[PDB]
């Protein structure tokens, strides 16, 4: 009864610095400080808790940002498709429909973004690059219409992808750019949704991805590098698209995600001995569903059919109590500013912590009020499961450019 | 020459040198989305940058212009690409370019483009003399900067600059034994030099890691290092370990201690060992001490473990 971060026992989950102090501990101690403030808010004040997802506030923030932005966004001028995707996806999660007005302007804009050599760049007439190509294509699928699907020039998408493909199974992020697992997953997300996977494309890729898993259990940006949430998500996800999860050592991967929930904060950190952050509500927590499916295609008999293998309630408690901006939008942690990236991923994360699907079994957990439930999100693509269905089914109708 | 934050700064449209060339405004279309309301300074630079890019003007003035475009938005990979094309055409002094990217990295260390660009320089110059020390200085400001480690590994690999790294690693672990980026580095050095399959080394390693776990039992990084080096080989290969961890339980306990014991019991039970049903209960027990008291943030994981053990060590 009722909220796990507020329970008395929980005071115990606070950092033990074994009386040895480093930057790491001081700094972790500091967030635990501010997080305790936020949790203790509800007591000290003198009224009971009840947790609300500020939906209408998030919506007005989103609706406006989709249209126009202040010059604080100069530095996201090479990432505009990302802005589309992040905002549209937050809208579809909060269950807000996209007017044909907007859908079609997004359409036309992403089209201006599309290179005559395949892929999309960060803005009109910028060169193509995999991150925006991935954002464009997801935004286009969130849209789901015929106009949106038709924007993609698949021939060129495949040329582009090939032009980035490296001998060792890896990809460049963009011509003359460099490599990192992100490129694998983007290539995988975009090739698969648009049905352009040829037999040779991802050859060597799963093995390259596999090499990025390290002694920690998780995946690093390139072989040798520390395990990190964003990269681990990309790796696994690219491996599920490719249907080669088995390549990784899934048991240490699991033991690694699980160790990344913070015991006091309830949220996730991107890597060990670093700081909680709301965007990891998706990059880390969204592993558990991917791992669930993958152990399941191996008969693993011991899996729950209620829950993902993380503290769903504590993640929810973190997102709601700590990552919400009263003004609208969401954030990394208390004291940081709003942005559409965190609005996107904190919400993608809350949806994952709400919804368990797994063959037959569906089971929910909606903390605080029940108007908090979001629409479900597909954990490979992080667009809605329906939009994934809809777009694969459609692209499945033309042939792999080849054929 | 004329800095973006100089009070003499003039928009490019007011500059004599540019009189001959028409700006290319951004084409956002009739009714646009995610439109950024750019400052004057910024839109001015980028209009002119589109002009030089379209015309493919390979010129000194274009080169200085890319500087400004970068400073306004260091994430614009199209601009960096053009700057590289200009570095080759205008055959520019790369040593001087290195001093530039040194300055910028120092300003915006968490940017992909900036490190990628440095990398391409070192590749062209075929010369890593400046790198360890450079990296060392960023790392002196953010000991965990992902790109700085990524760059460092890449350099150490390419130029076989292994000789002094472990000692770098020891200097940092001393300054923060919780720096998980430094433990990853230790694993990367050793694993590529001597390797872990040398007994003197595996020992010196394991002895170090326990010695750290002693000084600071609740640092998970030591714990993950310890598990990472042994488990390739199989924890049950090392029978003293189970015993020795059992010792410091009273005076040094932690959920990492209990979880390591469970990893040990897991390995024993898969290696057909002394007491199949016996060990199974020690494990399953601590699965509840963790799931229910000592590490409940992970309850759902610990119940999967108890429940997997049962599901395959029963009969
Ligand atoms: C400090 O300002 C930024 C802005 C953007 C980035 S990013 O493109 O490298 N990227 C997304 C990201 C976006 C935002 C943000 C700012 C404004 C908006 C729109 O409203 O979104 C903020 C941070 C951010 N980061 C940095 C970050 C996130 N959580 C904690 N931090 C310190 C993450 C980063 C993720 C990423 C995206 C694409 C990609 O190809 C690689 C990485 C990094 C720092
Ligand atoms: C599809 C796609 C492009 C996905 C993005 C993947 C993603 C989130 C990558 C993270 C990469 C990185 C260098 C993190 C370090 O940030 P930090 O060290 O500032 O943060 P931290 O302390 O939490 O690690
Ligand atoms: Zn974040």
Give the separation between CA A147 and CA B235, rounded to whole angstroms. 57
Q: Token pair 């932690």 is at which residue? A: B254
DSSP state of B273: -
Give the separation between CA B295 and CA B261, rounded to whole angstroms. 14
Q: Is A285 within 8 Å of A267 (Cβ atoms)?
A: no
Q: Is A36 within 8 Å of A13 (Cβ atoms)?
A: no
Give the separation between CA A346 and CA A292, rounded to whole angstroms. 21
Quick one: three-class SS letters along A334-395?
CCCCCEHHHHHHHHHHHHHHHEEEECCEEEECCCCCHHHCCCCCCCCCCCCHHHHHHHHHHH
Give the separation between CA A86 and CA A101, rounded to whole angstroms. 19
Adjacent-strand bridge partners of A179: A172
- Residues A121-133 as b/e (b if ≥16 CB within 10 A, e otherwise) read bbbbbbbbbbbbb
Q: Token pair 């700085």 is at which residue? A: B148
Contacts of residue B183, defined as CB under 8 A and 6 or more positions apart, other chains included, come to: B173, B221, B222, B224, B225
CATH classification of A1-403, choosing from 3.40.640.10, 3.40.50.2300, 1.10.3720.10, 1.50.10.20?
A: 1.50.10.20
Adjacent-strand bridge partners of A339: A330
For residue A73, the ligand 1 atom closest to its alpha carbon is 17
Dihedral class, residue B160 (left if φ above 0, else alpha if ψ from -120 to 50, else beta): left
Would you tell me how many other CB atoms lie within 10 Å of the CB of residue B87?
19
* Chain B positions in Cβ-Cβ contact with residue A225 (cut-off 8 Å): 146, 149-150, 153, 184
Determine the Cα angle at A260 with ends A257 and A266, to 5°. 125
Residue from A375, A284, A285 nearest A89 by CA: A375
| Distance from Cα A94 to the centre of ligand 1, integer Å | 22
Nearest ligand to the CA of B146 is 2
Q: Does B124 touch chain A (CB under 8 A)?
A: no
Q: How far is CA B278 from CA A374, B234, B261, B288, B303, in A?
A: 46, 20, 14, 16, 19
Q: How far is CA A159 from CA A203, A206, A209, A229, A241, in A?
A: 16, 21, 22, 30, 20
Q: Is A352 within 8 Å of A285 (Cβ atoms)?
A: yes
Give me the half-sphere count of Cα atoms (radius 13 Å) on the Cβ side of residue B119.
21
Q: Is A110 within 8 Å of B33 (Cβ atoms)?
A: no
Task: Tell whether A323 is in a known binding site.
Answer: no
Q: How far is CA A275 from CA B219, B249, B294, in A?
A: 14, 28, 21
Question: Sign of the C-alpha dihedral, residues B191, B194, B198, B203?
Answer: negative
Structure-block tokens of residue A371: 């108007």
Q: Token pair 């499916």 is at which residue? A: A293
Q: What residues does each domain of chain A span?
A: 1-403
Give the separation between CA A65 and CA A328, rounded to whole angstroms. 12
Q: What is residue A80's three-state secondary structure? A: helix
Q: What is residue B35's three-state secondary structure? A: strand
- Residues B115-130 as b/e (b if ≥16 CB within 10 A, e otherwise) read bbbbbbbbeeeeebeb
Torsion on CA atoms A386, A303, A7, A285, rounded to nearest 10:
-40
Beta strand A120-121 pairing with A128-129: antiparallel
Question: Sign of the C-alpha dihedral, residues B121, B126, B130, B131?
Answer: positive
Element (H, E) at B36: strand B35-36
Give the separation between CA A148 and CA A167, rounded to whole angstroms. 33
Contacts of residue B229, defined as CB under 8 A and 6 or more positions apart, other chains included, come to: A215, B187, B196, B202, B205, B206, B209
Give the separation between CA A62 and CA A70, rounded to whole angstroms. 14
Q: Token pair 């290092």 is at which residue? A: B225
Q: What is residue A128's three-state secondary structure? A: strand
Domain at B223, CATH number: 1.25.40.120
Q: Which of B35, B74, B78 sits opposite A67 (nearest CB)?
A: B35
* Chain A positions in Cβ-Cβ contact with residue B149 (cut-off 8 Å): 225-226
CA end-to-end span of chain B? 80
Q: Is A23 in Cβ contact with B299 (below 8 Å)?
A: no
* Chain B positions in Cβ-Cβ contact with residue A78 (cut-off 8 Å): 73, 75-78
Q: How far is CA B8 from CA A308, B1, B5, in A?
A: 59, 11, 8
**What is the total residue count of chain A?**
403
CA A377 to chain centre: 10
Give me the half-sphere count of Cα atoms (radius 13 Å) on the Cβ side of residue A374.
33
Dihedral class, residue A123 (left if φ above 0, else alpha if ψ from -120 to 50, else beta): beta
Give the separation between CA B45 and CA B11, rounded to whole angstroms. 8
Task: Tell whether A273 is in a known binding site.
Answer: yes
Q: Is A33 within 8 Å of A275 (Cβ atoms)?
A: no
Catalytic position from the list B41, B64, B92, B110:
B110
Structure-block tokens of residue B290: 């963790």
Closest Cα in chain A, distance from residue B119 (Å) = 10
Adjacent-strand bridge partners of A165: A171
238-277 in chain B: CB under 8 A from chain A: 254
Q: Is A165 within 8 Å of A159 (Cβ atoms)?
A: no
Q: Is B187 within 8 Å of B201 (Cβ atoms)?
A: no
- Residues B197-225 as b/e (b if ≥16 CB within 10 A, e otherwise) read eeeeebeebbebbbebbeebbbbbbbbbb
Q: What is residue A330's three-state secondary structure? A: strand
A336: exposed, middle or buried (C-beta count within 10 Å: 0-12, 13-18, 19+)? Answer: middle
- Residues A270-285 as b/e (b if ≥16 CB within 10 A, e otherwise) read bbbbbbbbbbbbbbbb
For helices A229-242 and A250-259, the axis angle rounded to 10 degrees is 140
Which of B110, B116, B147 most suits a substitution to test ligand 1, by most atoms within 8 Å of the C-beta? B110
Q: How far is CA A198 from CA A239, A403, B1, in A?
A: 16, 9, 51
CA A187 to chain centre: 16
DSSP state of A69: E
Beta strand B35-36 pairing with A68-69: parallel
Q: Is A161 within 8 Å of A187 (Cβ atoms)?
A: yes
Give the separation between CA A22 and CA A36, rounded to whole angstroms. 21
Nearest ligand to the CA of A72 is 1
Give the separation between CA B227 and CA A287, rounded to whole angstroms. 22
Give the separation between CA A343 and CA A339, rounded to whole angstroms. 6
DSSP state of B43: H
Would you tell me how many other CB atoms lie within 10 Å of the CB of residue B260?
20
Contacts of residue A55, defined as CB under 8 A and 6 or more positions apart, other chains included, come to: A94, A371
Give the separation between CA A277 and CA A322, rounded to whole angstroms. 10
DSSP state of A226: P
Q: What is residue A121's three-state secondary structure? A: strand
Q: How many domains does chain B have?
A: 1
Give me the half-sphere count of Cα atoms (radius 13 Å) on the Cβ side of residue B171.
9
Give the separation between CA B120 and CA B6, rounded to whole angstroms. 30
Q: Is A315 within 8 Å of A45 (Cβ atoms)?
A: no
For residue A182, the ligand 1 atom closest to its alpha carbon is 40
Q: Which of A108, A178, A309 sits opposite B304 (nearest CB)?
A: A309
B78: exposed, middle or buried (C-beta count within 10 Å: 0-12, 13-18, 19+)? Answer: buried
Give the separation between CA A222 and CA B33, rounded to whole angstroms. 35
Contacts of residue B199, defined as CB under 8 A and 6 or more positions apart, other chains included, come to: none
Dihedral class, residue A76 (left if φ above 0, else alpha if ψ from -120 to 50, else beta): alpha
Give the separation between CA A344 and CA B11, rounded to whole angstroms. 36
Determine the Cα angle at A265 with ends A264 and A269, to 5°. 115
Give the separation between CA A4 and CA A313, rounded to whole angstroms. 7
Give the separation between CA A256 and CA A221, rounded to whole angstroms. 16
B312 catalytic per annotation: no
Give the separation between CA B171 and CA B166, rounded to whole angstroms. 9
CB of residue A85 inside a 6 A radius of ligand 2: no
Q: Is B33 in Cβ contact with A66 (below 8 Å)?
A: yes
**What is the total residue count of chain B?**
315
Q: Is A84 in Cβ contact with B34 (below 8 Å)?
A: yes
CB of residue A235 inside a 6 A radius of ligand 2: no
Q: Token pair 């408690």 is at which residue? A: A317
CB of residue A333 inside a 6 A radius of ligand 2: no
Give the separation between CA B33 and CA A103, rounded to whole angstroms. 10
Residues A248-251: contacts with CB under 8 Å, at least 24 apart: A248/A209, A248/A210, A248/A213, A248/A219, A249/A213, A249/A217, A250/A291, A250/A294, A250/A295
A251: exposed, middle or buried (C-beta count within 10 Å: 0-12, 13-18, 19+)? Answer: middle
Radius of gyration of chain A (CA): 21
Structure-block tokens of residue A112: 């201006």
Q: How many helices (H) and strands (E) does chain B have?
A: 16, 1
Give catalytic residues of A, as residue numbers. Answer: 228, 271, 274, 277, 279-280, 332, 339, 342
Closest Cα in chain B, distance from residue A397 (Å) = 30
Q: What is residue A129's three-state secondary structure? A: strand
Q: Is A79 within 8 Å of A131 (Cβ atoms)?
A: yes
Give the separation between CA B88 and CA B58, rounded to whole angstroms. 10
Range of the domain at B130: 1-315
Adjacent-strand bridge partners of B299: none
Cis peptide before A96 (omega within 30 of 0): no
Determine the Cα angle at A55 with ends A51 and A58, to 5°. 120
Task: Tell whether A149 is in a known binding site.
Answer: no
Q: Is A177 in Cβ contact with B77 (below 8 Å)?
A: yes
Q: Token pair 């390419």 is at which residue? A: B158
Task: Tell whether A86 is in a known binding site.
Answer: no
Q: What is residue A172's three-state secondary structure? A: strand
For residue A65, the ligand 1 atom closest to its alpha carbon is 20
* Chain B positions in Cβ-Cβ contact with residue A127 (cut-off 8 Å): 77-78, 81
Adjacent-strand bridge partners of A128: A121
Would you tell me how many other CB atoms lie within 10 Å of the CB of residue A1?
4
Residue from A195, A184, A202, A241 nearest A401 by CA: A195
Q: What is residue A179's three-state secondary structure? A: strand
A218: exposed, middle or buried (C-beta count within 10 Å: 0-12, 13-18, 19+)? Answer: buried
Would you tell me how many other CB atoms lie within 10 Å of the CB of residue B230?
23
* Chain B positions in Cβ-Cβ contact with residue A273 (cut-off 8 Å): 178-180, 219-221
Radius of gyration of chain B (CA): 28
């Amino acid at each position: 009864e009722p909220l796990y971060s507020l329970r008395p026992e929980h005071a115990r989950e606070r950092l033990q610095d074994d009386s040895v102090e480093t930057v790491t501990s001081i700094e972790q101690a500091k967030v635990e400080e501010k997080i305790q403030e936020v949790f203790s808010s509800y007591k000290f004040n003198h009224l009971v808790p009840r947790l609300v997802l500020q939906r209408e506030k998030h919506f007005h923030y989103l609706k406006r940002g989709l249209r126009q932005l202040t010059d604080a966004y100069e530095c996201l001028d090479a990432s505009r498709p990302w802005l589309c995707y992040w905002i549209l996806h937050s809208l579809e999660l909060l269950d807000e429909p996209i007017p044909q007005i907007v859908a079609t302007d997004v359409c036309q804009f992403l089209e201006l973004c599309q290179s005559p050599d395949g892929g999309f760049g960060g803005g009109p007439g910028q060169y193509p690059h995999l991150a925006p190509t991935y954002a464009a294509v997801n935004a286009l699928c969130i849209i789901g219409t015929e106009e949106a699907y038709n924007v993609i020039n698949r021939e060129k998408l495949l040329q582009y992808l090939y032009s980035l493909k490296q001998p060792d199974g890896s990809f460049l992020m963009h011509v003359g750019g460099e490599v990192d697992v992100r490129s694998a997953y983007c290539a995988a997300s975009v090739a698969s949704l648009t049905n352009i996977i040829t037999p040779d494309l991802f050859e060597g890729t799963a093995e390259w991805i596999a090499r990025c898993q390290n002694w920690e259990g998780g995946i690093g940006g390139v072989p040798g590098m520390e395990a990190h949430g964003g990269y681990t998500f990309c790796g696994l996800a690219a491996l599920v698209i490719l249907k080669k999860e088995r390549s990784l050592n899934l048991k240490s991967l699991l033991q690694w995600v699980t160790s990344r929930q913070m015991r006091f904060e309830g949220g996730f950190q991107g890597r060990c001995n670093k700081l909680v952050d709301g965007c990891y509500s998706f990059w880390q927590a969204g592993l558990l569903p991917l791992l669930h499916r993958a152990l399941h295609a191996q008969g693993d008999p011991a899996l729950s059919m209620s829950h993902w293998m993380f503290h769903q309630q504590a993640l929810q408690e973190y997102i709601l109590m700590c990552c919400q901006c009263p003004a609208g939008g969401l954030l990394d942690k208390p004291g940081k500013s709003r942005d559409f990236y965190h609005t996107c991923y904190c919400l993608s994360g809350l949806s994952i912590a709400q919804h368990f699907g797994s063959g037959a079994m569906l089971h929910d957990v909606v903390m605080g009020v029940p108007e908090n439930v979001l629409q479900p999100t597909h954990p490979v693509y992080n667009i809605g499961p329906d939009k994934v269905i809809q777009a694969t089914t459609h692209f499945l109708q033309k042939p792999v450019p080849g054929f | 020459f004329l800095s973006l934050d100089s009070p003499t700064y003039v928009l490019y449209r007011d500059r004599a040198e540019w009189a001959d060339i028409d700006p290319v405004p951004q084409n956002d279309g009739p009714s646009p989305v995610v439109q950024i309301i750019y400052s004057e300074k910024f839109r001015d630079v980028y209009d002119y940058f589109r002009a030089v890019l379209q015309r493919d003007e390979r010129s000194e003035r274009a080169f200085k212009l890319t500087r400004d475009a970068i400073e306004l938005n260091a994430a614009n990979y199209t601009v960096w690409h053009f700057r590289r094309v200009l570095l080759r055409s205008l055959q520019k002094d790369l040593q001087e370019e290195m001093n530039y990217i040194i300055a910028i990295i120092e300003e915006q260390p968490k940017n992909y483009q900036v490190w990628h660009h440095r990398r391409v320089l070192v590749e062209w110059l075929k010369d890593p003399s400046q790198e360890l020390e450079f990296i060392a200085d960023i790392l002196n400001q953010d000991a965990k900067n992902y790109h700085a480690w990524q760059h460092r590994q890449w350099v150490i690999q390419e130029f076989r600059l292994w000789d002094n790294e472990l000692q770098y690693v020891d200097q940092l672990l001393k300054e923060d034994v919780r720096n998980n980026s430094v433990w990853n580095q230790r694993h990367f050095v050793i694993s590529n030099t001597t390797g872990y399959s040398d007994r003197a080394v595996l020992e010196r390693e394991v002895q170090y890691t326990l010695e750290m776990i002693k000084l600071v039992p609740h640092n998970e990084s030591a714990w993950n290092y310890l598990k990472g080096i042994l488990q390739d080989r199989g924890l049950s290969r090392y029978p003293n370990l189970l015993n020795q961890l059992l010792d410091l339980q009273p005076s040094h306990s932690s959920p990492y201690l209990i979880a390591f014991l469970v990893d040990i019991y897991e390995d024993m039970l898969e290696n057909q060992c002394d007491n199949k049903e016996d060990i199974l209960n020690k494990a399953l027990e601590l699965c509840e001490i963790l799931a229910k008291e000592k590490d409940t943030i992970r309850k759902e994981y610990w119940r999967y473990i108890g429940r997997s053990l049962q599901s395959k060590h029963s009969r």
